[PDB]
Symmetry: D2
Subunit: 292 residues, 4 copies
């Protein structure tokens, strides 16, 4: 559902840069078998940036189709134009998705009032649950706790993917919102800390390749067994860091390929193939994780 | 030119959020009368973010028609997917624009090699002169001097709009590029300094409302009359700062309207109307510039 | 001892800027009565910066004398010259203090290896327990977890006052050190979070004026009653922030004065009297805390 | 002068960590022969941090004697307590030094008003010309242009050593001060740029080992021959960078020794001997400068 280990799933491509269905199916089967709570489809790790909205929609539909009710699917729906965000959302009305992950507008750097108006308008024109998404390092702006608090009063704004890696934000946000509001980490390396502070889960890059460990860890964290969760986390930590040694999803797509989870590690420009140096850092991380 | 004062022109809109031709014509006549060297159409200040590519192309073509051979027009062509950058650039091939202003991919944060491959592919699918554009605060990435040097070796990559505010870049880039590679400021408050270090002009937001002073100031600069240029700069400096008191282009659109240069200060969400406190700030800066 | 609520105690001065004994006595009595675990004497809040080592020693001796065994006293001993650090430490051999709080060298910005050698040398030439102190915002350098880990193997380096407000440091450090090693917050605003993540206490500015609440909160945190601790913390939070509205200890010394805890709020230059604006922000914080 | 190339001279030490007179004399003769404009004695590069005030005064007086009227000598007088700044400055009153270099209080992070009161009190207890010194990365505080403007109104406050690396400050300060207030770079890698914007010279670490080129370069700059100056700057640029490959003055001391300019590269803890990897880096930069 909207807690636990949620995978920010790669969009597996062939050598032409087109979605590879066979590979997506394997990945979905892998997640159903590994205890992953939900799949975020065509988020950042999903290369939302370089799929056009038609392809973005296909991949979501294909993901849902392959999932076949076995695992909930959340659609990435973010756009830096509110009209575009709205209109992309409509595309997934009645699709079967359980909700949407919607990023703060990138590049144009709106005010807090602007972010409020953006997200309120989007929530207005759908019945689907909305997860807010904050990642200033990508977007150039920062959705502050106060504004999260105003937006949480809207019926179908139900949570936030907090990707700052600033852990003070957990309780600043939490004080300000009801206990039903979901607090999910968007930063693998600090996600166990995030959960220990009161977070409910993680929308994860690491889960693409360490699905089971991430699921166990997140469940331990929810039960208060932090010591036990850390042991897993310790072992995943090089992966938490080195999946970003080169721009996400370059490392993780290579990792999937190396595990045999996807046929090719192809991406679309401006993402470029992994360097040999990166190959060697990632492979070492995988082995530390015990995955290789 | 690709020297002197270049306006990053606002896209004036009617109350419905669509381009207002009467207001655009006024603006262009003004820049023609004021001695502005060129117009950048649908760059950041032109709200590229909230126009779709058709609307963007319409505004560019409308601007070109209205300019009527009197002043060169540079098309904003930025896009964070390389395929989309190519496709948008292709819309203007054999159109009469004199060049493209193309920004580093935002949000997806490519490597330097990715930046290289992005812009190289773009350059290769056009005869148009290309001006690179670096604005890390909006994009999440930083096109370093070295990559600039690499890209300057491509025939139709002929300049950079440097919006970091970091003046050390002028001479870092200069030493690595040829004598005729153009260096333009993207930061009004430091543009004169930029020019004094060896930059060749500015793509300016301030020029929207103080086109005459800006053209004056850059002429002085090119002729090496910096003390003189500097008297104008201090006249404009509060505008250089306070045009960003709220997110650009919210302040400059209000200022245009106030100066009677455009009919309405309407913008597209997620940009929001200027606050009362913001009006008063901007109006003060305009008084200081001698424009009210 | 070296856990719980530990006060970074002000050095109360008269109008000549000289230690006011009557005021220090009141403060010490207040801490013994309020359940404060220990007193840090002549730390940062204690104006170590502007007391010469002779005065620094007096204040420590006078604090110990007034405490009269009722409350443990830790001496600030930090110096950016290792010889000086050593020699200042010798001054407190057999004094009665239970330990020393020693800051990373300020201004000169040594390497990690330098910090290792600094702290190892100091620990060598005393039997007293040493608490490391990291606060990059003041010092210009950052003692990283890895180096904390090497230093924790030295017998009498027993803990760290981590003042970064970066909460990822708690478990990075903790993984690397034995379970006996003490992890204390040096940042009031994030101290409950710090403790929730595995910290043992706080060396606190807020404790100067909210001794009892801070003691209760820290004890709740140690017992795992985080929800109950947060309620207190919520009420102290404006104080956690506004005691730094102007440079520490300007606000807190004024606060003490306003409570009647000290006779004058005098400081030594380059610390300057509180502004009226600051007066009003602090008084509001105190009232929110219920202290006024 | 207080213009041209000014060396921030190393305090050469014997193997015991005490000033080595033979080596200091060599250094001074070299600067006299090389055309260095003035010597700053016991500034940051001179290890002010690890010398007590007597030792500091001894080195200053020794430097003055050895200079023997051949080259002006500026005493480092910084101190984070105002009383100590006054007392150290008083040691040099009627000594033959031509001015003091006095840094913003480090560690205690005063307000702008505190900075004002600090330096004003200092100026008032001496007839010596005072050069302000801003280096936020070491001190934790930033003396803004406006406060500089305020302080320039004091008679014996006559200049600033600006070590931010932020070139915008040259013209911000300049507009607020009188025509004869001196602006010196504190950042070798940007000093030529600093000068091209209107700065009057540099207090340099590079000049320790490339005194001749540095003096050449600043002459060219003052005469407005920037292209020419710039050929020298690129010859020195790897040294400008790699002299900080490890904490200053670890690299420049090793380089002096290597050039036979001093007997030993010994420093005081917490500064540590240069790493093997550091030697090789620095030696490379020296080869590039044409000095090996
Ligand atoms: K809600
Ligand atoms: K070119
Ligand atoms: K130990
Ligand atoms: K003066």
């Amino acid at each position: 559902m909207f807690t636990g280990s949620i995978v920010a799933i790669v969009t597996p491509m062939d050598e032409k840069g087109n979605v590879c269905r066979a590979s997506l199916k394997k990945l979905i089967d892998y997640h159903v078998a590994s205890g992953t709570s939900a799949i975020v489809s065509v988020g950042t790790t999903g290369e939302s940036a370089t799929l056009n909205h038609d392809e973005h929609a296909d991949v979501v539909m294909m993901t849902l189709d392959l999932a076949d009710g076995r695992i909930p699917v959340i659609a990435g729906t973010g756009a830096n134009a509110t009209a575009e965000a709205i209109s992309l959302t409509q595309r997934f009305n009645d699709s079967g998705i359980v909700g949407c992950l919607t990023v703060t507008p990138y590049y144009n750097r709106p005010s807090q009032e602007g972010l409020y108006q953006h997200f309120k308008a989007i929530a207005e024109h759908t019945d689907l649950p909305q997860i807010l998404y904050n990642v200033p390092s990508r977007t150039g702006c920062d959705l502050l706790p106060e504004t999260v608090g105003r937006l949480a009063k809207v019926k179908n704004i139900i949570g936030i993917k907090e990707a700052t890696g600033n852990l003070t934000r957990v309780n600043q946000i939490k004080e300000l919102v009801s206990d039903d509001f979901v607090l999910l980490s968007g930063d693998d390396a600090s996600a166990l800390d995030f959960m220990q502070l009161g977070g409910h889960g993680v929308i994860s890059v690491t889960a693409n390749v360490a699905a089971r460990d991430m699921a166990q860890m997140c469940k331990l964290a929810a039960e208060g067994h932090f010591a036990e969760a850390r042991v897993i986390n310790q072992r995943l930590m090089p992966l938490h860091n080195k999946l970003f040694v080169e721009p996400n999803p370059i490392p993780v797509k290579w990792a999937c390929k190396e595990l045999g989870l996807v046929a090719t590690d192809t991406l679309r420009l401006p993402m470029t193939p992994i360097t040999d140096s990166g190959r060697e850092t990632v492979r070492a991380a995988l082995k530390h994780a015990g995955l290789l």
